[PDB]
């Protein structure tokens, strides 16, 4: 059996190549200035925030903190959760999307490449607790690996100064894909700040410079769903301070 919605999701999954980084920056240009973007930082899981925003949102995308070598990352982690409660993994393994993992496997570097996976209308089937929803809710998803900072530190430390130059260059492509497919509502988060070991305050600043810069106004509403189980909330806190300008 195939679960409803999946067939059309796999058909519509498209790949964005490194050479299309130019056309993705033009897409930001055409969307810049469209809304008076309002912004918020919540302690939600990516899918919880998505469902919350679903009703009011015209076009709703979520960012998957993906692995660069395995669909679902080989399985705590956000991509592992997206795959338990939705249709993601059937879209990430679609034949058309395989160059993303193929090239990244040859890559030789823990910075990875600038392939992205857009998956339209990914049904969320289950809530955080693992219970089925009375009906599935669709959410478009953008898949991009943040550079593995921890793998870099162990293998090519001469590459550490390019970690942030990659995170920026790549977060601009994510927002590029999102403007490209004319999304109104984004759920972002602490991309690369767990298993991949980048600093949260660094990632959060990156996004900020983008949303007051090349992507200022490209989106109606951007939610940072940072799930942070620790009592003193380090990852979450960094996103609140570094984004307190934009949520006011
Ligand atoms: N369901 C969730 N929803 C929202 N935020 C979450 C969630 N889970 C964790 N966070 C927060 O997001 C932060 C980072 O989540 P991480 O999963 O490490 O993504 P990465 O980009 O660092 O690593 C990607 C690789 O790790 C995976 O294995 C992939 O398969 C790849 O192999 C966490 O600290 C949480 O605060």
Numbering used by the authors: 29 to 103, 108 to 280
Authors' own words:
Despite the abundance of PARP1, most of the PAR generated by DNA damage is rapidly degraded, with a half-life of less than 1 min by poly (ADP-ribose) glycohydrolase (PARG). The radio-resistant bacterium D. radiodurans encodes a PARG homolog, DrPARG, whose expression is upregulated after radiation damage, so it might play an important role in DNA repair. From observing the structural peculiarities of DrPARG, we show that although previously thought to be an obligate exo-glycohydrolase, bacterial PARG could exert both exo- and endo-glycohydrolase functions.
Crystals were found in several similar conditions, but they belonged to different space groups. Notably, the 28 N-terminal residues of these solved structures from different space groups, including P21, P32, P3221, and P212121, were not well defined in the electron density maps, which suggests that this phenomenon did not result from crystal packing. In fact, the missing residues located in the intrinsically disordered N-terminal region of DrPARG and might be highly flexible.
